[PDB]
Amino acid sequence: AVGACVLCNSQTSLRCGACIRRPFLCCKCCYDHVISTSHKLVLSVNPYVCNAPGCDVTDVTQLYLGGMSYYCKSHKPPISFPLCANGQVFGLYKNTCVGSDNVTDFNAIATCDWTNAGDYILANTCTERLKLFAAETLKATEETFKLSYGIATVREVLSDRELHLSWEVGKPRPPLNRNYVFTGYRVTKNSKVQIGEYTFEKGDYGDAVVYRGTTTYKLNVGDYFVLTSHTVMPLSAPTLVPQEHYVRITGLYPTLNISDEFSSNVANYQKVGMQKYSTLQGPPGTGKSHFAIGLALYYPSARIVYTACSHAAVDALCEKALKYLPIDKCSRIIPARARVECFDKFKVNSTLEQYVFCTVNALPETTADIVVFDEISMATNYDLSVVNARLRAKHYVYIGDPAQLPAPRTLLTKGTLEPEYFNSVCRLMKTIGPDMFLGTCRRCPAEIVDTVSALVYDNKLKAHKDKSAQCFKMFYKGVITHDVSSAINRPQIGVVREFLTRNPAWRKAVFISPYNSQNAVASKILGLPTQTVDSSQGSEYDYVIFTQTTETAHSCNVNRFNVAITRAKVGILCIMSDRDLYDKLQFTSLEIPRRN
Amino acid sequence: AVGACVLCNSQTSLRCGACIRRPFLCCKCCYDHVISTSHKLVLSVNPYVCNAPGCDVTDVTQLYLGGMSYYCKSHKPPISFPLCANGQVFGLYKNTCVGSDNVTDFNAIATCDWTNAGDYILANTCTERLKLFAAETLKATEETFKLSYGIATVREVLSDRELHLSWEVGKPRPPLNRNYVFTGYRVTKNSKVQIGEYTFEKGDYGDAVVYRGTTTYKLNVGDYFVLTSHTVMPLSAPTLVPQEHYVRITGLYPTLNISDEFSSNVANYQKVGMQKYSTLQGPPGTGKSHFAIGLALYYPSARIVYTACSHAAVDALCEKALKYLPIDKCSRIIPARARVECFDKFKVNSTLEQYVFCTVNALPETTADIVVFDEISMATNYDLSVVNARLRAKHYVYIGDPAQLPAPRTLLTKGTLEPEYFNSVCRLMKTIGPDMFLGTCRRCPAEIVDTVSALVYDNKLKAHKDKSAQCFKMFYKGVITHDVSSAINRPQIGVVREFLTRNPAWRKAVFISPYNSQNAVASKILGLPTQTVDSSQGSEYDYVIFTQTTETAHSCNVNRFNVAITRAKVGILCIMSDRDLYDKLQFTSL
Amino acid sequence: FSSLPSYAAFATAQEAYEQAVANGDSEVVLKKLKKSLNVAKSEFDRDAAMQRKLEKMADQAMTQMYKQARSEDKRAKVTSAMQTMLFTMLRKLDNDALNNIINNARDGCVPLNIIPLTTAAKLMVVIPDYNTYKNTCDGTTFTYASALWEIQQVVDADSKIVQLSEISMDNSPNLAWPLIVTALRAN
Numbered sequence A: 001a002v003g004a005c006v007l008c009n010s011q012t013s014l015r016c017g018a019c020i021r022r023p024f025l026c027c028k029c030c031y032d033h034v035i036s037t038s039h040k041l042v043l044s045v046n047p048y049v050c051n052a053p054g055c056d057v058t059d060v061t062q063l064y065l066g067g068m069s070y071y072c073k074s075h076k077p078p079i080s081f082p083l084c085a086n087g088q089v090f091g092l093y094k095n096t097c098v099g100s101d102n103v104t105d106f107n108a109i110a111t112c113d114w115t116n117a118g119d120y121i122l123a124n125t126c127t128e129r130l131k132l133f134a135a136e137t138l139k140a141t142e143e144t145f146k147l148s149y150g151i152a153t154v155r156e157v158l159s160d161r162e163l164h165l166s167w168e169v170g171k172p173r174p175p176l177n178r179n180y181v182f183t184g185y186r187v188t189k190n191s192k193v194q195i196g197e198y199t200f201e202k203g204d205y206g207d208a209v210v211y212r213g214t215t216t217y218k219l220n221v222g223d224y225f226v227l228t229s230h231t232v233m234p235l236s237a238p239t240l241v242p243q244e245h246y247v248r249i250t251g252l253y254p255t256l257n258i259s260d261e262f263s264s265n266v267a268n269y270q271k272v273g274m275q276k277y278s279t280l281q282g283p284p285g286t287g288k289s290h291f292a293i294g295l296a297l298y299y300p301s302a303r304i305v306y307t308a309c310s311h312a313a314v315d316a317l318c319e320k321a322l323k324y325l326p327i328d329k330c331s332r333i334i335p336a337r338a339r340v341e342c343f344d345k346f347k348v349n350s351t352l353e354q355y356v357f358c359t360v361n362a363l364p365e366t367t368a369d370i371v372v373f374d375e376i377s378m379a380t381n382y383d384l385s386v387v388n389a390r391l392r393a394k395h396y397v398y399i400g401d402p403a404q405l406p407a408p409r410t411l412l413t414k415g416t417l418e419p420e421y422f423n424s425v426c427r428l429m430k431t432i433g434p435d436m437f438l439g440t441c442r443r444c445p446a447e448i449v450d451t452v453s454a455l456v457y458d459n460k461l462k463a464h465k466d467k468s469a470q471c472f473k474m475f476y477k478g479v480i481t482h483d484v485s486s487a488i489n490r491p492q493i494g495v496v497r498e499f500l501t502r503n504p505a506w507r508k509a510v511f512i513s514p515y516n517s518q519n520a521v522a523s524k525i526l527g528l529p530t531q532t533v534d535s536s537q538g539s540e541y542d543y544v545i546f547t548q549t550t551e552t553a554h555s556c557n558v559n560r561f562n563v564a565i566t567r568a569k570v571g572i573l574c575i576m577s578d579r580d581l582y583d584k585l586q587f588t589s590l591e592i593p594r595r596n
Numbered sequence B: 001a002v003g004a005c006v007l008c009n010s011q012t013s014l015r016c017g018a019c020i021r022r023p024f025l026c027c028k029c030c031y032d033h034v035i036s037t038s039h040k041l042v043l044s045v046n047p048y049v050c051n052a053p054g055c056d057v058t059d060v061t062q063l064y065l066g067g068m069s070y071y072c073k074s075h076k077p078p079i080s081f082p083l084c085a086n087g088q089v090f091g092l093y094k095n096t097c098v099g100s101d102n103v104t105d106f107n108a109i110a111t112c113d114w115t116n117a118g119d120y121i122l123a124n125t126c127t128e129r130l131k132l133f134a135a136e137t138l139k140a141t142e143e144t145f146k147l148s149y150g151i152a153t154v155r156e157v158l159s160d161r162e163l164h165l166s167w168e169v170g171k172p173r174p175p176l177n178r179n180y181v182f183t184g185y186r187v188t189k190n191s192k193v194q195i196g197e198y199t200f201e202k203g204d205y206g207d208a209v210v211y212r213g214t215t216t217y218k219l220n221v222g223d224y225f226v227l228t229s230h231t232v233m234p235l236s237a238p239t240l241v242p243q244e245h246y247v248r249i250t251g252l253y254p255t256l257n258i259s260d261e262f263s264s265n266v267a268n269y270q271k272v273g274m275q276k277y278s279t280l281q282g283p284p285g286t287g288k289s290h291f292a293i294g295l296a297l298y299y300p301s302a303r304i305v306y307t308a309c310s311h312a313a314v315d316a317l318c319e320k321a322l323k324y325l326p327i328d329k330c331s332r333i334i335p336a337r338a339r340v341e342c343f344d345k346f347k348v349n350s351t352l353e354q355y356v357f358c359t360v361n362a363l364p365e366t367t368a369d370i371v372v373f374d375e376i377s378m379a380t381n382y383d384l385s386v387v388n389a390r391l392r393a394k395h396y397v398y399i400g401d402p403a404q405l406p407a408p409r410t411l412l413t414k415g416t417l418e419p420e421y422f423n424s425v426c427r428l429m430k431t432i433g434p435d436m437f438l439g440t441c442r443r444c445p446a447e448i449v450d451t452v453s454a455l456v457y458d459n460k461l462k463a464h465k466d467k468s469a470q471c472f473k474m475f476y477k478g479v480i481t482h483d484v485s486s487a488i489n490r491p492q493i494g495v496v497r498e499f500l501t502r503n504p505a506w507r508k509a510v511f512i513s514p515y516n517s518q519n520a521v522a523s524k525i526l527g528l529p530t531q532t533v534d535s536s537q538g539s540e541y542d543y544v545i546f547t548q549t550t551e552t553a554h555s556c557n558v559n560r561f562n563v564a565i566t567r568a569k570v571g572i573l574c575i576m577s578d579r580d581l582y583d584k585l586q587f588t589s590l
Numbered sequence C: 001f002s003s004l005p006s007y008a009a010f011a012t013a014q015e016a017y018e019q020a021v022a023n024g025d026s027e028v029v030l031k032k033l034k035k036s037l038n039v040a041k042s043e044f045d046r047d048a049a050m051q052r053k054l055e056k057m058a059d060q061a062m063t064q065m066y067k068q069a070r071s072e073d074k075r076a077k078v079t080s081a082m083q084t085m086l087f088t089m090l091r092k093l094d095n096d097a098l099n100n101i102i103n104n105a106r107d108g109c110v111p112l113n114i115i116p117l118t119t120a121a122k123l124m125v126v127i128p129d130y131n132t133y134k135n136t137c138d139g140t141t142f143t144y145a146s147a148l149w150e151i152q153q154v155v156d157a158d159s160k161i162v163q164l165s166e167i168s169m170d171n172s173p174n175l176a177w178p179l180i181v182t183a184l185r186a187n
Ligand SMILES: Nc1ncnc2c1ncn2[C@@H]1O[C@H](COP(=O)(O)OP(=O)(O)O)[C@@H](O)[C@H]1O
Pocket: B261, B284, B285, B286, B287, B288, B289, B290, B291, B442, B443, B538, B539
């Protein structure tokens, strides 16, 4: 019931009730926090408010302790005594509390709204314990904000997988995505019995949407689907593993001359072992995961773990390992979760396989000799601390590109985050350097690689496999039928309708797109299996269709264009209004009637 | 038992004594009320009296805390404090008494006698909760008044169905009708037991009264029939729900290509759909209850319940729905008494139906999807919030016409009441206008619509049928009692009896008499289809007979006559006694 | 007590006393100051003692009276609970057998111990061991209290279903042995 001061590591029995995470605080720290912020609510072994019957005096300052109980000033016993005095607040460890200077930032984090970019950079630079607390309360705020949406009810029932939704007028409708499950509550004569969770998907038509439910119960009119809540568990282990170095290669047994196809990184494989942790920066579509497989083959006896922020990314890594690493291999990623279909190869929890590959959402708290963490930009400090708590190895690798898509941060409505501010791993990579470099985007066309090198890069990216039918059909954006927050742009497919029955060889393509719902409209009329820009960054394809939306701040992201076309290998076609980008991308653009 | 205040709605638990309904008041609000009004009694977890048995002071102005109880000055203990606070009254909670000053209107509510139109109009102008409290206390006042009614010290009884009635001296001997409820009490030095729910109407002729009770003995001499009063329950729901605008339909199931007269009203139905509710303000006779069944035809899928003010209107609605809508999806809820007959062909109180009907006072406490109410003019603001509390649906429809006559409100014996102030809904209708309006009296032909639009209504009304040439008149006076005994014009009855033979298709003409005695005696003489206006409200007939007895504020009412004539279809014959009123209309005299 | 008439009068007495002390007047003036100070003290006494005496009694009256209100609320809650339990319990008994045996009685009063003996709809039997199980509820059906009962479901001590075929001499020393047998009324 007791703990160490969050800002002093001083043993104490006080936690601020009005604060969210209410960690332990020394008497001086608690006094400063309560006297600075309006958080006049401290949770000791008991609450502090007046013990008189019917009296609701709350402020600790107004409270006076009396006959073994607290009181208001009016109900004060003949021997009364105020609580908040002498620069401290009454409690255990009172005389032995140390006190520090972190009142201002603690108050700011306890009173910030997480909407502005200041919270992220503050959490990206603050104290280690403060970093942990900020990440915890950041995820807590994220969960609470999602828990403020509207309840989905029914207007009429169609079939087992078709149903009209009757949202409450005036409430924010949650996007009808796969990751949006809502428990089904039917009310009869009370019988307020849940019928299970239901996820929705906007089909090619009206309110009647196709939905997947955990249970096959009959869809009744007297049933609705309330949002499914989530909780945040406390994190104690630090985010970033401290930087160490070793004179000799320790905890790793080098191989002699095997796998020379990655001999450009063998000296790098040894130097990773002679350090503690060695992050690696690789431009989108470069020899990423090739360094990883080379290192894994260089140390076959050592136990190795892959880690990626995205399920698609870890699926790509595990597929690369299956193709390259010997099967002593498994990818223990996801048993039944992750609506986006991840591996279907081997065990999910056996902890006997060597090259155990997993993801944050189902990380087993085990240990290995080394572990490689990929896609280090689309994650937050919270998940970094989580993964550092789960696993613990002798050497760590954090491979990732700052010029990629960061964590969503749906509340980041003011400004944005710099590639250095995405997470503390990104900071460490971008303050002094990633202490490593691997740039060679050979798996992508050298023409598009050069154009990207002329887009935001310094022309340090070289590749092969140039041209082909690379183009960007300059079709103006039509009507935007955005049924959800994301923008649907079907008239862009209105020119793809002439790219479906015309192409004799452009059939095995993966249509990437900025917005998720404009990927959903391609899923409505499937000319080919499409993927969103979020499923990119780690698996490439020969052809990639690309249709954007109106000139919003989302589609016009240069990093989005980079990570979208770096999944192309021979050719590319993009459908944008193209007001400014049609001149920097050196492709032979076409038109609506000119496709031959 | 603690609640909010009313003027300030702060959390408190004080109530007033002299105020009949005993409402929750805060400290400052109660202090203001007792300073202003003559209310000198406050209720709390205990009554306020001088605890000393040698005193009986209940005034809150002076009362002294005698250790734990209240005392007078002549009994005040030495170490003791008066409990009249610093401009407040001491008690439950004082630190959270929010301030509000609109007490003067509230004081007037607990002051006035409801005999002046200023009382009633001022009542419908205050805060919602104040309006509810005023309606409640008015209903209680009416109940108390009708409680203090005649104690019939009868002496003779005629038959098993007929008796002789005589009354005491001093209290109002109430009229006799099936609407009222009476019961005799056997005074045999003991056993003053109820003899049953006894209704009473005046007999056929002479000093004769017809009696019918739940039990029926042969009544003795020493009994008496006292009018008892029913309790009034408090309410919480608002009289009027807020309005919300929409964009698309609110989840209703249509029926494509069903009828034709209502495809033009489909726009109006959608206008209803795009909002939480809608109303209807139009002249009588012109698609009122008829704009209803077609609207149901637009969305005849949900399980619904409706009702009406009086029985004739709801029975006509049942007949119309049977005519248009399928029978076995509609029902009509009947009361336990049911002394006044109803649609005696339909389901006997089938609450489990898709389109249900009922009366105002016997409504259940279930819910529906949509609903429509009949004749807001005939209703008060009390019953509006009553049905709001018991019934809660997703769409509401209201119908009414300001030109109609309002509820009796017998305590208001001074002045006339403006049609808007009949209830809150009528004020809203006259201030913001209607939601949808229909103006072409369809049952009456062009001559009747011309007469009504030229004389009382605005010259805007029109019809669809030409003159039926069945307009006739009569003016000669006749003689009445002139000493109580509400006027009966017997010579007119005799002349009608002598004449009628010449009028072939007028043998079944609906006779009209607002006065109960004339209404009974007309059927006693010949047996015409007798009827009163009140009970003709919202009805309609091919052949009607109206009879004016004499001149009086009742019989000279413009609204009474104009609502009487809106019920003409193909034929009518009516008589007057008044010269200028005889000359006002534009029909043939004869 | 700082806003009382005696507070102000003592304040002005002190002002006069200090003014005349700083003036340095005659000893008679000093005596007058002492008398004024002393009467100001006595006037300040009751006005700073009586109000404090009334404060405590007012506060304790508040506490007692809040307690009484709480008592009334608890009373209401328990009354509602009791009556709803009565009404929800009575509605699972009215078999017409009850009316039959009540009417057949001579005045209405019948002993309590026979009502569940005749109008009961389900029987529960607890059994110590196998030997007793033999000469009692043997087979799929049996008789007791002049009626026919058919076995339906059998559980052990730990509330696990036990199949009738498992109940045997040789298999007996493998079961928890307060066997509970529930049965219905065969008409
Ligand atoms: N559009 C219409 N076409 C034909 N008859 C109508 C129409 N509207 C109303 N009526 C006639 O009016 C009668 C009902 O009276 P109504 O017009 O509903 O007003 P109210 O019932 O209040 O007097 C019905 O018998 C119906 O025949």
